[PDB]
Symmetry: D2
Subunit: 171 residues, 4 copies
């Protein structure tokens, strides 16, 4: 009888995508992983394991946290990986992962959202669909998937003011 | 940049909305435009309306007109949003057209209207836009977080899903 | 505190939801419970399910059973969520029952299902809960941000609204 | 031919109810008035004039701002008034308005939301429905309408930690 394969694993490191309002803080905190909400209603043929690695706010996120993400991605059986993450340091994590030889036969995609998923008008659900497809279809490597396109982490910056990733032009 | 994408809308469950005059759902404005409005896209996209007919009412003549319309696009990356009832019929017909052989054509839609809570539509649109950009030339169905070969796929009406034959 | 409120659910557009098996809307779980879950209430509320029938299918016998059910409540403040097609018929029938004469009974619902985008349901529920707490004993329809006298009201099916006669 | 009366006027002073995410701030700001969004889809028989008075964040809100709200409410022709406002100083504004003899024949209700309207799971739409009804049905006075009940501002406090208004018990 046919067994539907589950080629994709998702890891979550928090970020804007997962932010939610809490009364105590009178403001946003990093909440539960929004990617789980999106996949719950995606009516998937397979299944996707979603493993939560970290929810630190961006200021507290360290090298040691980035090392733990590399160990988790490297230890996964799956060769197709989506990491949801904050956009302010996504490029630094992507560049770090691109240097691990352990990742050489894996397609690893980083994504997230400029607007929290739990806020009206969020990019999150589109971005998760696009990034899931990217993780399945791209050749091995490390990529950022945002704005409905694929970015090379070595040639990308975050424009903090505009909430967009932009290519670094070759000179 | 990504390659320019052309999106055609042929109606279906994805676009259904409630109307007081009908006391129920009717095919309304294309939901894909609502999703892409907030997707903060970098690439070139253009959305064109083909139809708001029920996909069950499509004739062979209708499918021939959808094929000619996809062939009017310069773009080589195409998304067609469509009802799931006859998505396999339209997809198999397009896959037979030599005039489309250099294009990546992806059909998608939703099992639950985009304007109803808990819909698959926004995820499906993201997934299918990536698929239209990234897959080799051909015709495909992108639903349920996977890519289907139309020749080897059927719509299970009772289970609300696509399945391998 | 406010006086305890009892809420009865009799179905209707407010509670409609999409089902793949029907390829369309059916009366689902009461939407009023979804609204009150996030309303952070201070007062006593209890929600009881009466029916998920189409309001057009209500008989005189059904309206008599709704009257007896409202009379089983100790509470003197009652909200009944209901379809708009026969809301005036149920409301006029309840207004004729001496056994309800000390109760404030408010009927409400929605023109657009709560689970569809752009629905009036959550505003209607807030408004009707206030109305059930604050109005003098009687039977009322609370819709469109106002209070209607059932005896002097009709459902315009074509315009999707209630109106004075 | 029948003219539908419009007995209710709404004023907006910002608060949590109106908060929205902005990329530049990387967080919530006081946005456009959420009550307008709720009434847009309420299918009203009448109309409601919605007048925006202030969007200051809570720290910048002063006595002079509170005085301007009292002048706007007193000058309105309508005798049924809903003021949407922050919950942290709603009691102080309500007590201030309760002391204006100019308001004596008006029903004035203050409301808002513990969770921004543009965040998932908000109380805002319910609260606006309830508070509109309260403004129409209550006898003249100044009230807070939250948690599906009516509070007397002289006998109410905000519990900041729990996001709730509570009665001050008579001793
Ligand atoms: Cl914030
Ligand atoms: Cl329907």
């Amino acid at each position: 009888m046919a067994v539907s394969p589950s080629p994709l694993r998702i890891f979550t490191a928090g970020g804007t995508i997962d932010e939610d309002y809490r009364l105590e803080e009178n403001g946003l905190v990093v909440g539960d992983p929004f990617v789980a909400e999106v996949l719950k209603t995606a009516r998937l043929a397979g299944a996707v394991s979603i493993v939560a690695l970290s929810r630190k706010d961006s200021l507290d996120f360290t090298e040691a946290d980035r090392e733990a993400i590399g160990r988790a991605v490297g230890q996964a059986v799956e060769d197709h990986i989506l990491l949801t993450h904050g956009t302010d340091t996504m490029v630094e994590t992507a560049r770090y992962l691109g240097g691990l030889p352990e990742l050489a036969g894996k397609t690893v995609v980083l994504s997230g959202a400029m607007v929290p998923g739990r806020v009206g008008g969020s990019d999150a659900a589109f971005n998760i669909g696009f990034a899931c497809a990217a993780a399945l279809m791209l050749a091995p490597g490390v990529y950022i998937a945002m704005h409905g396109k694929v970015f090379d982490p070595a040639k990308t910056r975050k424009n903090r003011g505009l909430g967009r990733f932009e290519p670094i032009d070759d000179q």
